[PDB]
Amino acid sequence: DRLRQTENRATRCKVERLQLLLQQKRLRRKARRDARG
Amino acid sequence: KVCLYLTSCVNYVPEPENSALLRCALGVFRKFSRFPEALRLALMLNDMELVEDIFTSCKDVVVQKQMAFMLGRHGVFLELSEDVEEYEDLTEIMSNVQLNSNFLALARELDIMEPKVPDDIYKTHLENNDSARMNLASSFVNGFVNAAFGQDKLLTDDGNKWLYKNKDHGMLSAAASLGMILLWDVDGGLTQIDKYLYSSEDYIKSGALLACGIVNSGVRNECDPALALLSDYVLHNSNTMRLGSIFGLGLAYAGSNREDVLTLLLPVMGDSKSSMEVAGVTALACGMIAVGSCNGDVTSTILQTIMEKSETELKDTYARWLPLGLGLNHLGKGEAIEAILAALEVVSEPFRSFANTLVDVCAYAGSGNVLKVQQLLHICSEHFDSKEKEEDKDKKEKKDKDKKEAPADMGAHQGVAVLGIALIAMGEEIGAEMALRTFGHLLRY
């Protein structure tokens, strides 16, 4: 139960970081298209 | 001819013709050059950058359409340097990123955004009137019907109470359907799957890892969210968790031949804790990542994993995925496989004929067969007829279609006739007579 709590906390901080990076890349992509149109 | 002496090299004859005889835009050149096993690096990637200055005409189109082995599309301009004029747009096309946002644009224009429930598809009101099994069917049907739409009516609203209507492995596949419901939505799908990654059930957590793999299948995202989430689970103590992480990586990184994903997976086949299911799913995932690449570490580690296994483990149903992972790594490759047939020859009877036919079938897929098929035919009716063990030529029929998938559609013109006056007309109990999958595999329309 302790191992799984440390594991799920490590996974969380990995997912929360990935979601931020995906959102930042998605915003950069969109900004290029919206500037071409 | 069947032998790769004119079949795979007569394709080079038309190559100059595009390159410098007719129009030089080379739009059709990429199509033609894909045919020679899609060699690409020495055949296409070296011979499409030249046009460049037809980026508005050919380059805008041929780059975006390309959906095969994907590193090369992201191997030029993209992260390579992007000095290539419009590098950043060419990389956004070859990566299939636009599937989700571009696919959802088409889905708005066709007015098909509204999610459909499995009962709309069944039409249970026109049906003239084991819950574990039923739920599982409706989870897969909801996944398939609402695939890449980012929205459903089953897992969105009350999805925790949907998952707990399934049992055991059914909860893994019900949680994985959320990935496949958002197929190609890499940016939005992770946020919907996140809620299951912290489950108190290994089946649900493994199914959520498999869902993360499914969502990335055929889309090369710059953030590598499949590799970055599945890596930590590949060697996990739990088996149920291993399966979801490894098959998730195999789906996320298919066709990429990513050394950093392969070096993480190859040790799992040799781990003392891996069941034959985990070893088979690992060889399968490596063969999907390295498909048609002839990767040496994938080849050697799978051959070794077959040679180190007992005849009692090679009789497990999951052992069939070892020579599949091996055959996928050499898919299309006709010349390269004699060494692998040679190495597999050392294995005993139950697995060797199955493994050799599966690797040979994967190498020379598509090419018309008139002489090797004769052997395949002679290796299709005359083994079990006069021996006690009634399983020797069954899979031979299975792969009969292989190498004759769509060979100018005249093979199919006869393949069914070949199977027409065949086993079903005079076959056996279950071994050969089970050519049913062959007919299905013959055509997909």
Size (chain A), residues: 37
B167: left (phi over 0), alpha (psi -120 to 50) or beta: beta
Q: Which residues of A touch B225 (CB under 8 A)?
A: 18, 22
CA distances from residue B408 to B5, B15, B60, B124, B192 in whole angstroms, order as listed: 19, 20, 30, 41, 44
Final resolution, Å: 3.3
- Cα gap B422→B417, rounded to integer Å: 8
* Alpha-helix residue ranges (DSSP H) falling in B146-258: 159-163, 169-181, 186-197, 202-215, 225-230, 239-252
> At a CB cut-off of 8 Å and minimum separation 6, what does B260 contact?
B227
What distance in Å separates the CA atoms of residue B325 and residue B284, rounded to the nearest whole number?
Answer: 4
| B414 CB-near residues (< 8 Å, 6+ apart) | none
Packed helices B296-307 and B259-269: angle between N→C axes, nearest 10 degrees: 10
- Please enumerate in sequence order all residues whose Cβ is within 8 A of that of B277, keeping only pairs 6 or more positions apart, or say none: B239, B243, B318
- Best B99, B100, B198, B201 member to test A by mutation, with max A CBs in 10 Å, is B198
CA distance A24 to chain B (A): 10
Q: Which of B317, B319, B179, B324 has its CA nearest to residue B248?
A: B179
Interface of B with A in 181-220 (CB under 8 A): 186-187, 190-191, 194, 197-198
How far apart, in whole angstroms, are the C-alpha atoms of residue B228 and residue A21? 12
Residue B225 CB: number of other CB atoms within 10 A?
A: 23
Size of interface A-B (CB pairs under 8 A): 39
Rounded Cα distance between B42 and B30, Å, is 13
CB–CB of B62/B55 below 8 Å? no
Tokens of B24: 């030089």
* CA separation for the pair B140, B118 (Å, rounded): 9
Within 8 A of A18 by CB-CB distance, chain B residues are 190, 223, 225, 228-229
Structure tokens at B418: 């070949």
The C-alpha of B221 sits at a distance from chain A's nearest C-alpha, in angstroms, of 9
Tokens of B6: 């004119």
Lookup: tokens for B119: 């009962």
Q: What is the rounded radius of gyration, in angstroms, for the C-alpha atoms of chain A?
A: 16
**What was the elucidation method?**
cryo-EM
- Smallest CA-to-CA distance from B314 within B357, B352, B287, B274 is with B352
Q: Which are the contacts of B24, defined by CB distance < 8 A and separation ≥ 6?
A: B18, B51
Question: Are A18 and B97 a contacting pair at CB < 8 A?
Answer: no
Distances (CA, A) of B416 to B406, B439, B445: 12, 7, 15
CA B88, chain centre distance (Å): 28
Half-sphere exposure of B216 (CA within 13 A, CB side): 32
Rounded to 10 deg, the angle between the B169-181 and B202-215 helix axes is: 30
Locate all alpha helices (DSSP H) within A1-37, ordered by sequence. Answer: 2-36
* Nearest-angstrom CA–CA distance, B161 and B163: 6
- Contact at CB, B223 and A32, closer than 8 angstroms: no
CA-CA distance, B254 to B68, in Å (whole number)?
Answer: 10
Chain A residues close to B228, C-beta within 8 Å? 14, 18
Contacts of B416 by beta carbon, 8 Å cutoff, 6+ apart: B439, B442
* Distance (Å) from the alpha carbon of B80 to chain A's nearest alpha carbon: 18
Question: Which positions in chain B touch A21 (Cβ < 8 Å)?
Answer: 223
- Taking alpha carbons only, the member of B161, B111, B116 closest to residue B141 is B116
Measured between beta carbons, the chain B residues lying within 8 angstroms of A22 are 186-187, 190, 221, 223, 225
Which tokens go with B141? 């049907």
| Other Cβ atoms within 10 Å of B427 Cβ, number | 16
Please judge whether B232 and A23 are an interchain contact, meaning their C-beta atoms are less than 8 angstroms apart.
Answer: no
Rounded distance between C-alpha atoms, residue B436 and residue B53, angstroms = 51
The answer for residues whose C-beta is within 8 angstroms of residue B394's C-beta and 6 or more apart is: B431, B432, B434
Judged by CB atoms within 8 Å, which residues 58-97 of B form the interface with A?
88-89, 92, 97
Contact A14 B221 (CB under 8 A): no
Q: Which two tokens stand for residue A5?
A: 């709590």
Give the C-alpha separation, B433 to B394, whole Å: 8
Could you give the CA distance from residue B432 to residue B175 in angstroms, rounded to a whole number?
37
H helices within B146-201, ranges in order? 159-163, 169-181, 186-197
For residue B82, the 8-state DSSP code is -
Separation of first and last alpha carbons in chain A: 53
Burial of B6 (0-12, 13-18, 19+ CB in 10 A): exposed
Per the structure block, which two tokens stand in for B60? 């805008």
